[PDB]
Design a protein around this ligand. Structure first.
Ligand SMILES: CC(C)CCC[C@@H](C)[C@H]1CC[C@H]2[C@@H]3CC=C4C[C@@H](O)CC[C@]4(C)[C@H]3CC[C@]12C
Ligand SMILES: CC(C)CCC[C@@H](C)[C@H]1CC[C@H]2[C@@H]3CC=C4C[C@@H](O)CC[C@]4(C)[C@H]3CC[C@]12C
Ligand SMILES: CCOc1ccccc1O[C@H](c1ccccc1)[C@H]1CNCCO1
Ligand SMILES: OC[C@H]1O[C@H](O[C@H]2[C@H](O)[C@@H](O)[C@H](O)O[C@@H]2CO)[C@H](O)[C@@H](O)[C@@H]1O
Ligand SMILES: [Cl-]
Ligand code: NA
Ligand code: NA
Lengths: 536, 214, 216
């Protein structure tokens, strides 16, 4: 009868807000604006967010709350034929923890590297430097900046690895950092929601404090207005381009993370009659809103670099890890009270990651706990058994060629896997389970049915939206490359197994569960398309 | 179970006046889950206010509502005769669903004395064992009226059926039917029957009588 | 536009069973949750049972739980309430009410159908003409309907040609029998210049009689 519930409502919101808001809100969204026409970019971004983005986000939250179970069991009880979706999502989440947690390790490595009167990455005269070192970022590949060479030749030691075939030694300063991250994750997640629910109070909130003072510090710098100009100055010639819409579509989907099994897990500890429609609208908004603020943070400082430091905006305006571990720390080193801004920046970067790691792990734990009561009472031992597996294989990212391994998983593990998974999630919930059947479930919870708007999106828009992203993801596909290095064919094939191992669960479970039931062909489908609620 | 009590039970209002009526719940109710229904006499209920501030379709602007928690109220700015009905508050907050005890709205009207009519037993009725003499008290205000039956000057308190009409939507008055039922043998044992209506309009009771023989 | 008609219902002996139906039209019946609400002869409203749009969620009041079963047919657009183990407390006007949104309440109601649970036996009334013992401007006449069961009875004057000056009193139950009367007033010139009749209907006993009023 009983299932554990959130203590207080805020904990749930902070957990969702936390999982949702991460480094991609910082090192991706602002860049996309800059590249896509600035203020103009908000139109396709907004529409995509409205039609495909929020509906999927809303959907999984409602499902999580209604069915009251983790990913595996919930999709089993919804469309038994499609129960495979549960396994696909849990595996993906499993693969992702292997790499993503290392970003937090880097944040902590820099944090620990940040207590000095003079930051190590400011000059070119150190031992890890090369004769080609520059004070700041340029447009030539052979000549890097001071901050770039610090990250590459010192922190990473990536220069000593000839590719993925050669990982080299193990940096045990990085191993230490990765352990500390998993230690924190353990002591956060081992007691369940009662703890993890209140830990996210700090980790979800802290970033906004630091965003606040970095925003002021940024806008009070010379040339900060020039940054904002590059960031938001509207160009609508981009709007006609399909590539922009794809960029908006893709960003919205991967920033919100709908159908990732995390939202499902969190909402499953919700009280049945809780209003999840408000929770979805507020939570989504806060995510995009956070990205918007962060753009100001970044580009104010990026403008100051182009003004006082004499670097071309093109060169310093970047996405991904490069932005936060090189470009931004570079500007910080120049301004007064540098040691202060560096310390809170890398701490923000860490707490930005932590929120999301909890969710990912939680999706896995909750999913398994429900399907296997065997591990449900043993949870304190289980996540230890989990994070241990994480840490062990995670050591591959702490080697000198560890980035090559990291970059491999980043492209393959969750990229095309979760898209097809969520695509079936949409088709399951709407075409199979039915919208009217679904809408009825929601009315029982929050008292009123979903508007015809939400019902249209879940049915026609969602699949086309997902399909739209998937198609252009395949169209523009290129073999895996990092910098001047080109991954071997056997490396790509390895990733495709990782990409395919999750997705294959969908048909596998269907075919298997189909042969394991009695009756006709059409008689078996009705058995596997009958919800668990209808059988009572 | 969340019980909604309404007061007043009944209230009279002179047209144009302002009426307020309250609905209070034993347990708090979400302000968006509280609704009001108007039910006119001999008709089925109509949704009136929902979410407690929100008028339904066709509901004139003279109606308003407010409240929170365990306390809510319906107010009519300027009352009209087409506003006379019973009003029911309803809670959709949780199961089981409960309705308020209701507040009956009536129109004030100038006092008017009744008109008494006596009707001795029909011969069709006197062919069978029974004899029923009936009295009609018509178009009086206010509602309260008192009937007394006397047989040959001595009061009879037994075997009486009284019925009141609902307030008239035209003249806003009430009416009552008093029927004294007795066996024929007793009807033939007494020569005179009287019906007396006491009402606030008259100090002395308005009386009408009839004699058996005639 | 949207209409709701309650059907079935009438006299039933205690312990009995009856199935009430509601014919929905003028909207998409499938998309709306329905509910049965009853009103006792003491005019108190009581919610009875709610059924979802697809009938996959059912809620009952503790009073009818286990005795009553709410039901839907979305093909024929009909709402059903099938009752069993009926007690006397079950006697009421049963309403078919729509609403899909808890926040908006019940926005539409049927005309209602009347259920009477009694051990009492159906009996026809006896209609007695009421004429004065022995001005103007207005004379007053009457009709006495006594000793009938169950309700209702339809009483009109001259086939309903007089709506004016007519007071027809609600029936009162005494010892398992209903008694009802009506008064009509007209001018002394109008009666007995013309013969005036009172007509009563009681379908339960299938009894329809007209009684002409004549002066004694
Ligand atoms: C300019 C920028 C830096 C300001 C940052 C805004 C911060 C303060 C915002 C962003 C998200 C917000 C939180 C969103 C979620 C909730 C749940 C609600 O039940 C209580 C308030 C609370 C906890 C909000 C408090 C304020 C909040 C933390
Ligand atoms: C740019 C940042 C700061 C905000 C981005 C705009 C977001 C929050 C806006 C833009 C378009 C909006 C949507 C427009 C249409 C609808 C349909 C309505 O029935 C529910 C609200 C909903 C779903 C809106 C939700 C909020 C929304 C998604
Ligand atoms: C699939 C579960 O998601 C995560 C699992 C482990 C670590 C982090 C996770 O976060 C999501 C993510 C991040 C990168 C790649 C795939 C998935 C979140 C990151 N925050 C927004 C939604 O996506
Ligand atoms: O043994 C590796 C340690 O090196 C770093 O310590 C640096 C520090 O970053 C730098 O600011 C200081 O000036 O020199 C020391 C080492 O000489 C890391 O901070 C440590 O975590 C490592 O263990
Ligand atoms: Cl974003
Ligand atoms: Na995000
Ligand atoms: Na996070």
């Amino acid at each position: 009868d009983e299932r554990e519930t959130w203590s207080g409502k805020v904990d749930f919101l902070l957990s969702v807000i936390g999982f949702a808001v991460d480094l991609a809100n910082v090192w991706r969204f602002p860049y996309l604006c800059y590249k896509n026409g600035g203020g103009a970019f908000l139109v396709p971004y907004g529409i995509m967010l409205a039609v495909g983005g929020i509906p999927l986000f809303y959907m999984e939250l409602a499902l999580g709350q209604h069915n009251r179970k983790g990913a595996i069991t919930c999709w089993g009880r919804l469309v038994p034929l499609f129960k495979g979706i549960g396994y696909a999502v849990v595996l993906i989440a499993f693969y992702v923890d292997f790499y993503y947690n290392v970003i937090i390790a880097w944040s902590l490595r820099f944090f620990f590297a940040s207590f000095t009167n003079s930051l190590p990455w400011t000059s070119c005269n150190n031992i890890w430097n090369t004769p080609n070192c520059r004070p700041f970022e340029g447009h030539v590949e052979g000549f890097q900046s001071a901050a770039s060479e610090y990250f590459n030749r010192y922190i990473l030691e990536l220069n000593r690895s000839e590719g993925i075939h050669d990982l080299g030694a193990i940096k045990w300063d990085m191993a230490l950092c990765l352990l500390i991250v998993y230690l924190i994750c353990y002591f956060s997640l081992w007691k369940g929601i009662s703890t993890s629910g209140k830990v996210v109070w700090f980790t979800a909130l802290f970033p906004y404090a630091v965003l606040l003072i970095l925003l002021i510090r940024g806008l009070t710098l010379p040339g900060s207005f020039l940054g904002i100009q590059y960031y938001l100055t509207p160009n609508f010639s981009a709007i006609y381009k399909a590539e922009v819409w794809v960029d908006a579509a893709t960003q919205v989907f991967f920033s919100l993370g709908p159908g990732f099994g995390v939202l499902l897990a969190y909402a499953s500890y919700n009280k049945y009659h809780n209003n999840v429609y408000k929770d979805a609208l507020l939570t989504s908004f806060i995510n995009s809103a956070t990205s918007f603020i962060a753009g100001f943070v970044i580009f104010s400082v990026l403008g100051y670099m182009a003004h006082t430091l004499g670097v071309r905006i093109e060169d310093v305006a970047t996405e991904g890890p490069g932005l936060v571990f090189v470009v931004y720390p570079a500007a910080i080193a120049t301004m007064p009270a540098s040691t202060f801004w560096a310390l809170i920046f890398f701490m923000m970067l860490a707490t930005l990651g932590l929120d999301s790691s909890f969710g990912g792990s939680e999706a896995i734990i909750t999913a398994l706990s429900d399907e296997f009561p065997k591990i449900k009472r043993n949870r304190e031992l289980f996540v230890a058994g989990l994070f241990s597996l994480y840490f062990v294989v995670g050591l591959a990212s702490c080697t000198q060629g560890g980035f090559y391994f990291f970059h491999l998983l980043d492209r393959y593990a969750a990229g095309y896997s979760i898209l097809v998974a969520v695509f079936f999630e949409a088709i399951a919930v709407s075409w199979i389970y039915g919208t009217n059947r679904f809408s009825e479930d929601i009315r029982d919870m929050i008292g009123f049915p979903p508007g015809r708007y939400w019902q249209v999106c879940w049915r026609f828009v969602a699949p086309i939206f997902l399909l739209f992203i998937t198609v252009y993801g395949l169209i523009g596909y290129e073999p895996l490359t990092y910098a001047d290095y080109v991954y071997p064919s056997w490396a790509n094939a390895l990733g495709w197994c990782i990409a395919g191992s999750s997705v294959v669960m969908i048909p596998a479970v269907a075919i298997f569960k189909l042969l394991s039931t009695p009756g006709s062909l059409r008689q078996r489908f009705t058995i596997l398309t009958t919800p668990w609620r209808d059988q009572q | 179970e969340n019980v909604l009590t309404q007061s007043p039970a009944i209230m009279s209002t002179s047209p144009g006046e302002k009426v307020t009526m309250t609905c209070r719940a034993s347990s708090s109710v979400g302000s968006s889950y509280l609704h009001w229904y108007q039910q006119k006499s001999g008709a089925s209920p109509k949704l009136w206010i929902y979410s407690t501030s929100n008028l339904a379709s066709g509901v004139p602007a003279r109606f308003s509502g407010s409240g929170s928690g365990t306390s809510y109220s319906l107010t009519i700015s300027s009352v009209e005769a087409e506003d006379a009905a019973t009003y029911y508050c309803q809670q959709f907050s949780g199961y089981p669903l409960t309705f308020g005890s209701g507040t009956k709205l009536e129109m004030k009207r100038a006092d008017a004395a009744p008109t008494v009519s006596i009707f001795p037993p029909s011969s069709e009725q006197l062919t069978s064992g029974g004899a029923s003499v009936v009295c009609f008290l018509n178009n009086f205000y206010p509602k309260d009226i008192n009937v007394k039956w006397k047989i040959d000057g001595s009061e009879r308190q037994n075997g009486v059926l009284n019925s009141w009409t609902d307030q008239d939507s035209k003249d806003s008055t009430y009416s009552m039917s008093s029927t004294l039922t007795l066996t024929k043998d007793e009807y033939e044992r007494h020569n005179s029957y009287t019906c007396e209506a006491t009402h606030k309009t008259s100090t002395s009771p308005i009386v009408k009588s009839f004699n058996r023989n005639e | 536009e949207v209409q709701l008609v309650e059907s079935g219902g009438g006299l039933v002996k205690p312990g009995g069973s009856l199935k009430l139906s509601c014919a929905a039209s003028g909207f998409t019946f499938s998309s709306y949750a329905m509910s049965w609400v009853r009103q006792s002869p003491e005019k108190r409203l009581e919610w009875v049972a709610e059924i979802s749009s697809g009938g996959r969620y059912i809620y009952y009041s503790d009073t009818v739980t286990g005795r009553f079963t709410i039901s839907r047919d979305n093909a024929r657009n009909i709402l059903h309430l099938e009752m069993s183990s009926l007690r006397s407390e079950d006697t009421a006007m049963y309403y078919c009410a729509r609403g899909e949104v808890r926040q908006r309440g019940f926005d539409y109601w049927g005309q209602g159908t009347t259920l009477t649970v009694s051990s009492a036996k159906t009996t026809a009334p006896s209609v007695y003409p009421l004429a004065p013992v022995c001005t103007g401007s207005s004379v007053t006449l009457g009709c006495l309907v006594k000793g009938y069961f169950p309700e209702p009875v339809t009483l009109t004057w001259n086939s309903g040609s007089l709506s004016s000056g007519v007071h027809t009193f609600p029936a009162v139950l005494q010892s398992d029998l209903y008694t009802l009367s009506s008064s009509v007033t007209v001018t002394s010139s109008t009666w007995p210049s013309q013969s005036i009749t009172c007509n009563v209907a009681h379908p339960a006993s299938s009894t329809k009689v007209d009684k002409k009023i004549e002066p004694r």
